[PDB]
Each structure stands twice: as C-alpha cells, then as structure tokens.
Design a protein around this nucleic acid. Structure first.
Lengths: 239, 88, 275, 571, 141
RNA sequence: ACGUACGACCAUACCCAGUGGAAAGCACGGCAUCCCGUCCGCUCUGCCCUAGUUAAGCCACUGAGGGCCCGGUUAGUAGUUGGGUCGGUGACGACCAGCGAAUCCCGGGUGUUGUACGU
C-alpha cells in the first residue's frame, strides 16, 4: 500500500499537478477565512486543509512550512493572517524540494469583497479548470518585479491538470486578473471570475456574453522574499 | 455586435495553458460608483474571452467517439517552476 | 464508572460523517475519476435504498455543491400499475428505467456553441455494500437499458458464477420480471400456510399471482417507455404551502428572544442567586 | 580584544592588586608562576576579586599568558582561571564562552593529549615535577570543562560537539595511570556530560581506540570500590541511548546489571566514603525516576467484552512474574529490602540523618513510580502480585516506626505513605490507627500541589478507599466532609484532592460503606450545599498563574455534578 | 410509561472453554452449540436465537436458579461458570456470558447512519436483576 | 416552515443532563426461498410495509452546564530581530527602529445555506 505512496512521493520526469495546502494563522478575520474558502473551492480537487489554527509566521521562520511540505507533499501554500498593521493578508508560498522558493503577500480590501454565495448563478463544476486572461501593463516588466511574480503564481494556482486535448463542452469560465498601470498609491490587482454564455449574432464565430459569479477580490501586493538564483536556475530547468 | 475586436496592441496568446496575456493598458474609470467599474471590467473581460476562444477555434478540431469535438492544444510554452527536479 | 477526565484539542469530523451519511473518501475518488482529464463534467447516478422506498437522483457537482438533473422515486411507480413491493429488484430496475427515460426526455435527445451523442454516467452506491446481486446493480441495469451509457461489467450481476465467467441470462431475465418473488410465493403457498398469509398480505387481498406479476411488470415497463411523466396523489394533499407553513409554525416550539432571555436571566437570578 | 580604558576609582585603592597584575604581565615565567598563588589567594577572598576583574585580568591571561610557548606560564594561567571559575558563578562561564575559550580549551586538550599519549620519549620516563605539572594542567582542564558543562544547555551542546575533549576523557579513564583526584574529576565530568546527551553516549559506546565502554562495564561488574561512581555514567548512557528492558542493546543493555553492585555498596554500609553511599543512593533514585518513562516508552511501541467476561466469570488468578521487566525484578527482590534496612538505622549521627533522608527519597521515587501504574480491574496483575507483599513490608517496617516519632522528614514519609497506600487500596495493616496520626499531622501542619496537606489528604483518602473496617471509613468521611464545609481556610488544591478522594471512596453502590456511611450520615446534603461555594472559588482562581490548578478544579466541578446526579439517581 | 419496544431481550450467549485439550474441547462446543467453534489458547462459540435461552436455561438448571450479586455487571451483561460439562449432558470447565439488549440495538451496529444508543434506553444492572428474578424465578444473593 | 435524498461552510453544528415531537417521510421492526456473506441472517445481502412503537436514532426546546465562535479589548505590549545607538569587567540593562503573541476582561451567539421531490 505504501509502495504507490512512495512512488507518488518520488520525483518524476513528467510532473503531476501540484497539491495546494490551505492553513490558518492564530488570528484570522472572517474576510480572510471567506477568501481562503473561495480559493479552496476553486482549487477543490488538488488541495488539503488544516483546521488546527497553526501559530506560525511565514516571513520570519520557514521551518514549519518545510515540515508540513515534507509531511503532506504540498508544493503550494496559502496562509491567511490578520494584524492591526496589516488587516487581511494571504501569503502565497511556492516551495521546491521542501525548501521555500518564493513568497508573496496579498492585502485584501474587505469593503469591496464579494463571496461566491452572493451572486446566485450556476457555478463552475468541481475540477474543471478555467481559462485565464491577464490584462494589464504591470505584468509586462523587464526587471523581475511584483506583478510578474503574482502572474507566475496565479498561473500555478489556476492551471489544474494539463492536457493536450480539450473538449469544447468546457471553456465556459474565465478567471480575469487585471493590474493597473504603474503610475502615488500602489497599483491594485483585481481578480474576477466570469462565466461565458454564447450568443451567435455573428455568422461564423459565436459572440461571448459574460455573467459574473465567484469571488470578487481586490488585492494589493505587499512583502516579498524573492528566490535565490541557485534554486531558480536548478528548478526553472526543463527535463 | 461584432465577433472580433481590434486593439492597439496585439494579444499574446498561449493556448497550452488556455492563456492570453494582454499588453493593452486597461483604463480604470476610478469612479465612486462601483457599478460602472463592474461593466467596464466585464467589457474588458468579454473582449479578452472573445479573443481567447477565437484563437482556440482557429486551431483545428477533430470529432470523437466520446462525442465531444476536441480542440488539439499546442504544448505549454510559458516557463513555470518545478515540484521536484529531474532525476539522474 | 466515574471521572470524566478531559479535551479542547479534540477536532470533530464533518457534518455528514458524524451523521454517517457520506464517506468523503469514496466521494473524492468518484469525482476525480469522473473528470476524464479532458475538462468535461460527468454526471454521476446516485441510488439510495431506504426501507419502503428507492431514491434515484442524477447529480452533478458544483461549488455550492450539487444540482439535481432529474430525480426518480419509487412512489410514482404506483401510477404505472405496480403497487406491492416497491423496494425489490424489479422495482429497482423499473426506477432505473424510469430515471433513464426521464433524463433522456428532458434532455431533448438557442445559440449553443458546439460548432447523436448518447449520454454518459457513473454509478454511485454510497455506503451500501457492493456485493453481487445487490439492487444498486438493478438500478444500474435499468439505467443502462433505458438508453444511457454506463461503463459496467457483468461481474456483479446476479445469476453469475464466480469460478467461471458465465452469466446465466435466464436467471437475470427471471429477476427483471420479479420471478424470484413469484417462485417464493409458490414455495410459501405450497410448503407453508402461516408465513404466506403473514407476508404477502397486499398480494393476497389484491389478487395477484406469479404469471400475473410477470405480465403486470411487462405492461408496467411498456407503460414506462410510453409516457414517463405521470403524476400521483396518495394520501392527503393539502396544497398551497403557505397553509403548511402556518401549520408548521403553530406547532413549532419557539425560542426565547433577547428580551425573553433577559427575563429568563432575571428569573434565574431571583430563583437561584436571590433564592 | 579591544583596548578599553581602566577607570580605577575605588574608595579602597588597589594596594596589592597592582603589583600582582604587574608580575602577571611580566615576561618571566617563574615570576608569573610565583604570583599565580598570590593572585589565587587574593581571588579566594571577597570584595577584591571584582577589582581584579576591573583590571581585565582574564583577557591578559587568555590572549597572552595561555598563548605562551612555555608550558609553566600556561599552567599558572590555567590555575588562575580555574580559581576564578571556582569563585564566581556561571555568568563568568558564559563570559568565557563568548570570548571563545572553547577553541583554546580544545587546542590545549589536544596538546596535552599529544604529550601524554606519546610513547616515543615516552611519557613514563619524565620527571615527577613535569608529570605533576601536566596533571595539574589536566585537572584545570577537567574542572573548567565540567563547570562550562554545568553552565547552560547550549554550552553543554557546544562541549559535546568537540571530539578532542571527549577523546581526552576516554584516554584518561581508559589509561587509569593518573592520580586518583584527576581520575575522580574525569568521572565527575563524564557524569555531568552524560546527562541527557545522545552524542556523549554514542561516543562512549562507539569508541574502538580504547574500548571505553568495555572498561566501564568490566569495572561496574566487578567489586572495585570507586567503580560505583562510573556506574551512573553508564546509567546516563542507558538514559541516552534508550537501552532498557523493552529493547536492550549490546549484551542485554539494561540497568539491572548496574543494580547489584550498587546493592553491594548498600552491603558495604554498616550501622554506626560517605560520598560513595550518597552517589549510590542518588543513582538508585535516578533509576527509579527514569523507570517511569521506561514504562511509557515500552507501552508506546471485543477487549472490553473479554475483560467483562473475565471479571464477571470469577476466574481471577495470579500467575507469572516480571520476566519482561528484569530491572524491576532486581529492584524489588534486592534493592527494596536494602533500602528498608538502610532507612531504619540509628539516628545518632547527622551522617545517618542525611543517609536516611536520601534513602527515604529513593524509596519515595521507586514507590511513586510503581504506584503510578494502573492496577484497576486486574490489569498488570503479575507486577501487582510481586509488589504487594513488599509494599506491605514497606508499610510495616518503615512507615509505622518513623510515624511513631522535622517538617521535611514528615513530608518525605507522607509522600512515601501516600505512594504505598495508592497501591495497597485499603488493605493497609491498621495497627495503632495510623489515620489518626495522619489527621494529627495535618492539623499540626497549620507549586500548590506539593504541599504537606495535599499529601495528607491523599493518604487518608487511599487508606479507606476500598473495603476496610467501617469505622476507619467513617472517620475519614467525617473528616473530609468537615473539611469541605469549612472551605474558607484551605487552599484549592486540598479541596480538589479531597473531592477526588471522596469520588474514589464512595463511588459504587455495591460496597457496604455506601449504605452504612454515605446515606446514614447525610453527606449528599453537605455536597449540595458545597457546590455553589466551590463554583465561586473555582471562578476566583486566575488562569495565567496556575492553569493546571484551574483545569483540575474545573474537572472537579464537572465530576462533582456527575457524582451528585449519580447519587440522586441511585438512592 | 412503559413501551413494548423497550422490553428486555437476550442478544447472545457466548460459550468459552480455556494443544490436544483445545482440539477435544472444540468438538464439545460443536456438539453442544450445533455450530463450528472458533479458536482464539482457548475456544469460544457465539449462540443466538431461540436455542440460546434453552442453553442458558440448562445452565441455570445446573446452578439451581441461584446467582450471586457480583456476577451481574454494571453494563447489563451477566455471566457465571460451571466447572464440569458432564452434568449439562475428561472434565471440562466452561463459562456462560450473556448480553442483554432492547429493540433498537441496530442503530449502533449498522453501516449507514451509525449512532450511539440513548441514555434512557441503555440497560442498567438493576433492570437485569429484576428480569432475572421475574423470568426464571431465581433468587440473587 | 417541516421531512427525505445529495451537498457546501465543517463544534454557533460537539459533550453531559432534562422535557416535547400533528401530518407525511425517516426509522425501529417482520421473515430466511432465491442472489449473497458469517463461529452466530449480529453486521452485510435478499423478501414483506402488513402488525406495532415514538422507547432509542433523528428533530425541537430548556440549563447562572463544560466547550466553541464573532466583535471590541489585553498590545503595537510581552517576547523577538543581541538588528542599530549609550551604560556595564561582566552577566546583561537602557534606548531607537522592523517583526509581533496569549490568558484575563467586556458585549453577543448556540447554526446558516444550495438544488430536487414531497408533507
């Protein structure tokens, strides 16, 4: 029974999809819990949850993250936390060979946040990966900056399971993340989920119509711990 | 109601991950009323999804016994990190 | 016998596991299997056996969690002729056939983007044990004969030997038209009298027999394939649900409001703190 | 190594510290060696050593005197530094650690090991003055490394990291050609280093250059007089390597082999050198304390219907022995009567008073370790059958004559009597009414769980816990209810333990004490009156100071509600 | 008041006898129970249905309808033992252990919707003693 | 509103002790020929919803109940960064920034909700 578990735990040439992990801090407001609930709902197949309110801080010490990643085989973590200095934070962590590769902090605006339950349409089925569109000038930067890192982890969150053949009966949902141009105030990233209803007013191609469901999140990017070039060169390579 | 949109910057589509990076700057109205912001964002998303499935349906399809017409996808070209490195 | 010694570190399980109605390991295994690695949703056919009833929905999985496509029950088979034994194998096959006919009728099999595709399903048995001869496979056989395509083998059908891979289709065709109930009635009538009257009371008073049961189930199946959208009324249909809402509200033990909670706290203070 | 200024502005001028510092700073080795004795004599006195540390004498010793090529100046510097270590507390050792004295101490250890281990001059042909200076150097190394090991936990880890000093200890204890003081200090430093240290025990058991574990095992097996000071070191090794009864290592590595020689040391004690006996008692008490986590690590690595069928069927029987726990067999069969004989010695000497105090401490440790094991409903039956007549022997021989006669001695004998009564469970020999003496002790008695009254409440609860003469149970119940009614003048720990004993005594209705004592005296009315007052006092306890007491008092309140509901239902 | 659905009922009657001796005792349990017994050091068989009350009635006929107070457990089950199996019908000693349930026990043992039986429905010791006094007309001392 | 099936948040839903549950549905229950599985038709599987019983399951309510949760607070404190400046022979202490807990305390709560079919 443990032989297949060891085979799945073993490194493999063609990568299996990454298992995300959702865990909660000591303090957590209801908005951050609802945000993690929506993200865990959108990543429902390949994820695990901890309800044990772990008392760790990801930016000071990363040993507990290494322990959890080696124990549960999780290459992606979302950590929710709340402070008086920073009201609602979600930190995305990508780890490679059970060591922390990349971390980022998202500050969520609680006044403009809407959950999935507040929209009342048909929702996305479990495990169907959505299409992605990334509209914004801030994602195209020469120097590696915050928004390129945000793109490089929101792609890894919403990729799901890769396949070279996709039936047309999917392709019904888009995840639209948009960033303002870098102008005083820091630019605001925006995550919206939309569903596609096709109306064929055109002769040949169908015309899309967009109906909103899902989370409505307004992020502002915060603290960062960029990857070392030694880990980046060795983990960015291709088989 | 056209089925295509023309923008000053061409889209950079990556069909391996069902992706479309759009380098045209989104014009945020920055108004107090959230409603007009919602229709503007929905219009931008509508144009993005229109370009996305137009580029998907440009690629050749094949009907199948499963009864779903399948769209053949190119291999993914966007660089991504790795869970565990290449053995040997 | 004493010393309840405690446990704030104790973490409860889920709501539908403490009640013991759903095994989430098998549910996760079922929804992962259904993906097909193509991004296409697959409908799973659930079947749950109560006493006196068979419940057959045909669910799909969502974020809020579930949407019933079409639901077939064992009650409305009383509208098609069969009235006794709405739990056995023949009623299970009839409910599966009715469910397949209903889901194939409401599917239709205005600007769709697919620019004659038979339907697909996955069997769900739930917490019922998947032994051979179990009526979950009767519902599965009724669905797979009604017109939908379920990936299945004849390993778990009854009348099937285990040391050789031969399926006795005579035994299966006997169970479809309820022949085991017929021969059990014959055996209990000939070699007994007390149990054949103690059981089968509604069989006796409605004057049905073996060949009558076989032809009656066959006529029921033809009626199912004819018009699978009948309606039934049974006992006491007081309609206009607001009447039922008023009836339930005037038999509901109401709580104590915040003013009533303050009054109860004052009464407890005057009765215990002030004696 | 910053050159900070010296602000000498004391009211009493350094009339002799200045010439001593000038002689220490002089380049003459003989003058420094002569001034080392005067500086050590000055450092031995108080209110002037602090002036020497104002002179920064420790830096001058560390970077100049100890770095000298001549070995005599190094010997004088090590004598100075060991005198300053002996005089001052562990913050001085932390200060030496932060100046990196560990690298220099390892370099000096390697140098002295190279000078002693060599057979090319050889070491044996050297003069007695030279070898005496070398052994004085090694004595300074040992006393300094022992005090740094005793300083802090991270210093202990850093000393255990360095391999050269451990190799020096192994060669010193295996060569055994040093004088007796150096060998004894090496034994003491291995004792201090071996406590809860996996690395030291691994280096002891994995050495093949000298095979130090073989020498220690051969010494511990034989009747060598000093060998008992080695034995606890091996015990610490068996504390570190998890080599016990459940999984022995080489040659059946258990503490039982260490048992009889120490018991033989107890045979060397006569009524009417003492360090040997004290260390043997300390090592025996250490074994008795460590046997508890030995049991829980043994346990770390349908049935209810079967237990009910065994209990209800009246098929209870006694068979078997402690074959799986040979250390317990050697402790019960040999060590317990020796501690009984040692405890009842005449009290004419204060040395015998200290010996009796340590013997009662060891008996208390082993009795609490045995009595914490669950003997309810016949589980662990053979251990109970082995322990039971020896426990009655402990009650008859030790508890009664000591109790016939110090608050500390009374506390120790009360803890021991509670440990015996927790396993006897009302089968104690009621001779001369010892419960009345315990009541008199508790009335004369007039972090919170270690009081004298708590242990008195615990022992007077256990003596009548099971069937025993109705009058003993009657007096205990009257005393406990009288304590519960007058709850204003007692700590909450006494209330919690009195409630726990009252639950354990009058639990089931099958006993005659429930009908004869509980219902005839109306204790339920007193408990129902007591419930809101104890609710108020358990709401009065702060949580951040004593969370353990608060949790146990909340458990006591919940069990009191359940018990009063039980006695209301069962009538 | 009282319900017909809460009346006492015998659930089972397990028979237990503690190399060659076990082989000989297995045939004795097989001929007495009518079923094939199972091994553990000791052999035991489980007997249900209408024959279990007959076997327990014979066992109480051996002990002439008198049982001690300590034999009734606090859970509700009760047991005893007979040192010779010859008088029932090499000497073998065997013990009789019996469990009591009400209707509605199945809610603790089913697969779907497993639940705990209620506090007011659990069997107590004194009801078992009253049942023992009522049915076989035996005296508990 | 109430009930079932399938669910989503996964203790505001659990734990202990009391009192009540129209309608229908859930159950409990009845039987051992066939399919099937056991030392034992106890569980699992098959046949009867007739006879019963709300006793338990389930639901509802009550309790200065234990627990748990939400909001305010305890704190930008303790602790930490020995990260920077002054004392201190030291051990370390002040000081300035970054990171940053918890009990106590005060107020309130004991489940919301989606689809389908019913009463």
């Amino acid at each position: 029974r443990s032989k297949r578990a060891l085979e799945k735990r073993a490194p493999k040439i063609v990568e299996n999809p990454k298992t995300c992990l959702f865990l909660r801090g000591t303090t957590c407001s209801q908005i951050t819990q609802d945000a993690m609930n929506d993200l865990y709902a959108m990543r429902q197949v390949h994820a695990k949850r901890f309800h044990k309110k772990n008392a760790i801080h990801p930016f000071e010490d990363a040993t507990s993250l290494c322990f959890f990643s080696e124990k549960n085989d999780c290459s992606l973590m979302v950590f929710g936390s709340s402070n008086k200095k920073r009201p609602h934070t979600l930190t995305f962590v990508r780890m490679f060979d059970y060591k922390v590769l990349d971390m980022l902090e998202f500050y969520l605006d609680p006044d403009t946040y809407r959950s999935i339950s507040q929209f009342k349409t048909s929702k996305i089925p479990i495990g169907m990966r959505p299409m992605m569109v990334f509209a914004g000038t801030a994602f195209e930067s020469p120097v590696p900056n915050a928004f390129t890192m945000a793109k490089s982890m929101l792609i890894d969150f919403f990729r799901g399971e890769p396949s070279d053949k996709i039936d047309v009966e999917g392709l019904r949902f888009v995840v639209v993340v948009t960033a303002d141009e870098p102008t005083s105030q820091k630019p605001i990233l925006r995550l919206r989920v939309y569903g596609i209803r096709t109306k064929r007013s055109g002769t040949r191609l169908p015309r899309v119509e967009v109906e909103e469901h899902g989370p409505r999140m307004d992020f502002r990017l915060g603290r960062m711990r960029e990857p070392d070039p030694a880990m980046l060169k060795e983990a960015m390579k291709k088989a | 109601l056209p089925v295509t949109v023309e923008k000053p910057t061409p889209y950079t589509f990556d069909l391996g991950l069902l992706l479309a990076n759009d380098p045209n700057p989104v014009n945020v109205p920055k108004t107090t009323d959230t409603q007009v912001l919602e229709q503007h964002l929905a219009s931008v998303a509508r144009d993005g999804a229109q370009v996305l499935i137009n580029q998907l349906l440009t690629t050749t399809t094949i009907t199948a016994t499963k009864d779903g017409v399948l769209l053949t996808l190119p291999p993914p070209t966007t660089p991504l990190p790795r869970e565990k490195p290449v053995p040997q | 016998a004493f010393h309840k010694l405690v446990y704030s570190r104790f973490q409860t399980k889920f709501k539908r596991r403490r009640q013991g109605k759903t095994d989430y390991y098998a549910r996760k295994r079922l929804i992962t299997q259904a993906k097909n690695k193509y991004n296409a949703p697959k409908y799973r056919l659930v079947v749950r056996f109560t006493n006196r009833d068979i419940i057959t929905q045909m669910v799909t999985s969502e974020i809020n969690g579930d949407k019933i496509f079409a639901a077939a029950y064992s009650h409305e088979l009383r509208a098609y002729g069969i009235n006794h034994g709405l739990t056995n194998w023949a009623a299970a096959y009839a409910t599966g056939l009715l469910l397949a006919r209903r889901v194939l009728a409401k599917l239709g099999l205005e600007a769709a983007e697919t620019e004659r595709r038979p339907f697909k399903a996955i069997l769900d048995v739930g917490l019922a044990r998947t032994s051979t001869g179990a009526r979950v496979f009767g519902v599965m056989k009724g669905a797979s004969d009604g017109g939908i395509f379920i990936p299945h083998s004849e390993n778990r059908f009854p009348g099937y030997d285990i040391e050789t891979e031969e399926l006795d289709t005579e035994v299966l065709k006997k169970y479809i038209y309820g022949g085991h109930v017929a021969e059990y009635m014959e055996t209990l009538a000939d070699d007994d009298e007390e149990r054949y009257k103690s059981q089968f009371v509604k069989y006796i008073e409605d004057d049905v027999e073996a060949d009558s049961l076989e032809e009656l189930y066959a006529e029921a199946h033809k009626q199912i394939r004819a018009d699978p959208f009948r309606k039934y009324v049974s006992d006491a249909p007081k309609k206009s649900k607001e009447e039922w809402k008023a009836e339930s509200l005037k038999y509901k033990k109401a709580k104590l409001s915040r003013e009533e909670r303050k009054a109860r706290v004052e009464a407890k203070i005057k009765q215990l703190l002030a004696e | 190594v910053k050159p900070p200024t010296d602000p000498e502005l004391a009211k009493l001028r350094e009339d002799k510290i200045l010439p001593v510092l000038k002689d220490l700073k002089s380049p003459d080795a003989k003058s420094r060696t002569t001034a080392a004795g005067a500086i050590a004599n000055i450092v031995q006195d108080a209110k002037c050593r602090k002036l020497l540390l104002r002179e920064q004498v420790v830096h001058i010793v560390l970077t100049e005197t100890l770095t000298d090529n001549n070995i005599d100046s190094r010997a004088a510097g090590w004598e100075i530094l060991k005198v300053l270590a002996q005089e001052e507390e562990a913050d001085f050792c932390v200060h030496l650690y932060r100046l990196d004295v560990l690298t220099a101490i390892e370099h000096a250890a390697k140098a002295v090991l190279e000078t002693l281990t060599t057979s090319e001059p050889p070491f044996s042909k050297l003069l007695k003055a030279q070898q005496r200076l070398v052994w004085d150097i090694t004595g300074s190394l040992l006393v300094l490394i022992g005090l740094l090991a005793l300083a802090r936990d991270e210093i202990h880890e850093a000393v255990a990291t360095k391999q050269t000093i451990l190799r020096l200890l192994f060669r010193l204890i295996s060569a055994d050609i040093a004088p007796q003081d150096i060998y004894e200090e090496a034994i003491s430093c291995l004792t201090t280093l071996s406590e809860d240290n996996l690395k030291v025990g691994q280096a002891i058991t994995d050495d093949q250059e000298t095979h130090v574990y073989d020498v220690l095992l051969k010494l511990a097996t034989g009747t060598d007089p000093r060998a008992v000071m080695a034995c606890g070191v091996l015990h610490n090794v068996f504390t570190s390597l998890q080599w016990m009864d459940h999984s022995p290592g080489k040659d059946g590595a258990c503490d039982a082999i260490l048992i009889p020689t120490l018991t033989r040391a107890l045979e060397h004690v006569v009524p009417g050198y003492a360090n040997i006996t004290l260390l043997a008692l300390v090592t025996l008490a250490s074994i008795g304390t460590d046997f508890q986590e030995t049991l829980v690590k043994g346990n770390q690595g349908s049935e209810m219907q079967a237990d009910m069928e065994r209990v209800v069927g009246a098929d209870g029987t006694d068979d078997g022995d402690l074959e799986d726990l040979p250390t317990l067999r050697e402790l019960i069969q040999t060590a317990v009567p020796q501690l009984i004989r040692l405890s009842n010695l005449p009290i004419d000497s204060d040395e015998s008073l200290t010996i009796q105090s340590h013997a009662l401490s060891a008996l208390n440790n082993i009795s609490w370790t045995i009595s914490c094991l669950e003997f309810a409903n016949g589980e662990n039956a053979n251990i109970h059958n082995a322990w039971y007549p020896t426990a009655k022997k402990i009650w008859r021989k030790t508890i009664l004559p000591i109790l016939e006669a110090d608050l500390k001695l009374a506390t120790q004998v009360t803890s021991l009597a509670w440990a015996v009564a927790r396993v006897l469970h009302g089968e104690t020999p009621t001779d001369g009414n010892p419960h009345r003496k315990f009541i008199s002790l508790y009335h004369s008695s007039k972090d919170p769980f270690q009081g004298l009254g708590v242990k008195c409440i615990g022992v007077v609860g256990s003596l009548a816990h099971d069937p025993a003469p109705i009058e003993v149970n009657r007096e205990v119940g009257v005393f406990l209810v009288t304590l519960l009614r007058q709850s204003n003048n007692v700590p909450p720990a006494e209330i919690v333990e009195a409630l726990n004993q009252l639950f354990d005594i009058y639990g089931d209705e099958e006993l005659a004490c429930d009908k004869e004592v509980f219902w005839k005296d109306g204790f339920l009315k007193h408990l129902e009156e007591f419930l809101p007052k104890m609710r108020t006092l358990t709401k009065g306890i702060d949580k951040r100071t004593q969370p353990e007491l608060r949790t146990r008092a909340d458990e006591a309140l919940l069990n009191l509600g359940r018990f009063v509901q039980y006695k209301k239902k069962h009538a | 008041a009282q319900n017909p659905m809460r009346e006492l009922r015998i659930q089972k009657l397990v028979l237990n006898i503690s190399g060659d001796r076990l082989t000989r005792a297995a045939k004795v349990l097989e001929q007495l129970s009518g079923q094939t017994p199972v091994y553990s050091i000791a052999v035991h068989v489980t007997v249900r249905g209408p024959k279990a009350e007959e076997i327990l009635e014979r066992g109480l006929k051996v002990k002439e309808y008198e049982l001690r107070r300590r034999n009734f457990s606090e859970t509700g089950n009760f047991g005893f033992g007979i040192s010779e199996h010859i008088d029932l019908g090499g000497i073998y000693g065997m013990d009789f252990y019996c469990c009591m349930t009400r209707p509605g026990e199945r809610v603790a043992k089913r697969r779907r919707c497993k639940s705990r039986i209620g506090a007011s429905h659990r069997i107590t010791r004194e009801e078992t003693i009253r049942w023992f006094k009522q049915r076989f007309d035996g005296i508990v001392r």
